[PDB]
């Protein structure tokens, strides 16, 4: 229920659509809040399908992890979320690196495991877990930020099938499009990666897995190779400065074996304990 005339554009914030920020100020004079704006470029017919779909899925969310939904915006249906002001994680950590400490990335890794724990008890799969769809609220609080791959789990079965983002994505989602709580605990576990390479640009997944790939594979040959990497137990290596009790988290995140793989609550409790030993 906002009003697009009210909408005041300040700036843009990034890109299956845009992200504006915007002052809402319905009475015309100069007040009111900075909000994000989310819309489609473009809206195909079944884009706005699925657009609507993150729209109930966001208003369905109230967790202290995740963004808030505000409202919604007809004039070109737009999606109004609070606004988060030191933007994504990974360029947080990029920017401010200097005054992160591991004890601060571990406090970050247990909050995205709480909001995954919270999105689990909703059946609700993200598909998407990365840095870059992560918000910063301030120094001491994330947010799960974008829900735009999310999906619901049908009510009989604990699986979901459906430019991927493929260096985040588990084997049996690569090979048989299969999605569950289990795989978003293998991108998960490449969150934490990410968060421990702090964002170094040739330490990103793409990079390495290109590497470790070979530079020369192009186009669709690259997945293929990635799958076959993968089965054959190639691993992202160790960050520098990585401590092994975290490293083996990763690892067990990445077991090719989806029941073997932690849940969330096993992750959050362990994080959360090695935390305080530090
Ligand atoms: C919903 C929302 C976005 C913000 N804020 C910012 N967003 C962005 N980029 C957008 C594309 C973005 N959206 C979601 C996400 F997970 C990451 N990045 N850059 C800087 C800021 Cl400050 N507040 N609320």
Partial sequence: QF?????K?????????????????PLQDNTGEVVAVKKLQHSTEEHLRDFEREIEILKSLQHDNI??????????????????PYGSLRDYLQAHAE????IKLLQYTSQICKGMEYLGTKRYIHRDLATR??????????????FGLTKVLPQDKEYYKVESPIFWYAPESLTESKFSVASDVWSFGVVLYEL???????????????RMIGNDKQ????????????????????????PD??????????????????????????????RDNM
Wanted: glycine share 6%.
């Fill in 196 to 210: 421990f390479t702090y964002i170094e640009k040739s330490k990103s997944p793409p990079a390495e897995f290109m």
């Fill in 99 to 102: 005054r992160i400490d591991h």
């Fill in 67 to 84: 963004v808030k939904y505000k409202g919604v915006c007809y004039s070109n249906l737009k999606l109004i979320m609070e606004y988060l």
């Fill in 133 to 146: 769809n992560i918000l910063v609220e301030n120094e001491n609080r994330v947010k799960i930020g974008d």
């Fill in 219 to 242: 186009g669709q040959m690259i997945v293929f190779h990635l799958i076959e990497l993968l089965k054959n137990n190639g691993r992202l290596p160790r960050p520098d400065g990585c």
């Fill in 245 to 274: 009790e975290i490293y083996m988290i990763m690892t067990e995140c990445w077991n090719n074996n989806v029941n073997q793989r932690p849940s969330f609550r096993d992750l959050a409790l362990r994080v959360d304990q090695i």
């Fill in 9 to 25: 554009f300040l700036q843009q914030l990034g890109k299956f659509g845009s992200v504006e920020m915007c002052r809402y100020d």
């Fill in 3 to 7: 009003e697009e005339r009210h909408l």
